[PDB]
């Protein structure tokens, strides 16, 4: 995604308003840029954050913030890759993982969530201890 | 293993919680 594509997917008015909400001295921190990206429905990972940081440092001008948002687009995202990641841990091929198991996965590798973030993400999907991870991934991409 | 896909999942969880 370049900025032109980005501004067909998100509303530029929101992009600007959210920048104004968080900016200081005409610039926005990467943490606040990621917060804005999420509000706009985008899903940055640490890969995207480290990329923009290498280019511009941790405090972005408006145009650099636009370039960051374009990096956050991720058109190739899909449910299948997520299900397959969880299915890796589903040895008995039940289609289920417990909340404890999913919490472990989410808080151990990659851009690890805190225990509370993981608990809150899981409890929000289901009151029950056994999670149909296929249904969970469909819901997370909703 | 499968780290890229895990990062995408964690990214969507952070998105949804925002």
Swiss-Prot record, chain B:
Origin superkingdom: Eukaryota
UniProt-annotated location(s): Cell membrane
Subunit structure, as described in the record: Component of the glideosome complex composed of GAP50, GAP45, MTIP and MyoA; the complex is formed during the late schizont stage and in merozoites. MyoA, MTIP and GAP45 probably form an initial complex in the cytoplasm which is then recruited to the outer face of the inner membrane complex via the interaction with GAP50. Interacts with ACT1.
Domain notes: This protein differs from the typical myosin heavy chain structure in having head and tail domains but no discernible neck domain.
Family the entry assigns: Belongs to the TRAFAC class myosin-kinesin ATPase superfamily. Myosin family.
Functional summary from the UniProt entry: Myosins are actin-based motor molecules with ATPase activity. Unconventional myosins serve in intracellular movements. Their highly divergent tails are presumed to bind to membranous compartments, which would be moved relative to actin filaments.
Protein name: Myosin-A
Organism: Plasmodium falciparum (isolate 3D7)
Gene: MyoA
Span of the entire protein shown here: 799 to 816 of 818
């Amino acid at each position: 995604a370049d900025i032109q594509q980005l501004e067909e997917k998100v509303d530029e008015s929101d992009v600007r308003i959210y920048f104004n909400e968080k900016s200081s001295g005409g610039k926005i921190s990467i943490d606040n840029a990621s917060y804005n990206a999420r509000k706009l429905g985008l899903a940055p990972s640490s890969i995207d954050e480290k990329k923009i940081k290498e280019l511009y440092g941790d405090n972005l001008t408006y145009e650099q913030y636009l370039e960051y948002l374009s990096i956050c687009v991720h058109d190739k995202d899909n449910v299948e890759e997520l299900i397959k990641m969880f299915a890796h841990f589903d040895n008995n091929c039940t289609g289920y993982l417990t909340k404890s198991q999913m919490k472990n996965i989410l808080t151990t590798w990659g851009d690890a969530l805190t225990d509370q973030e993981a608990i809150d993400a899981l409890n929000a999907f289901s009151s029950e201890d056994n999670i149909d991870y296929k249904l969970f991934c469909e819901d997370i991409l909703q | 293993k499968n780290i890229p896909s895990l990062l995408r999942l964690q990214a969507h969880l952070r998105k949804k919680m925002v």
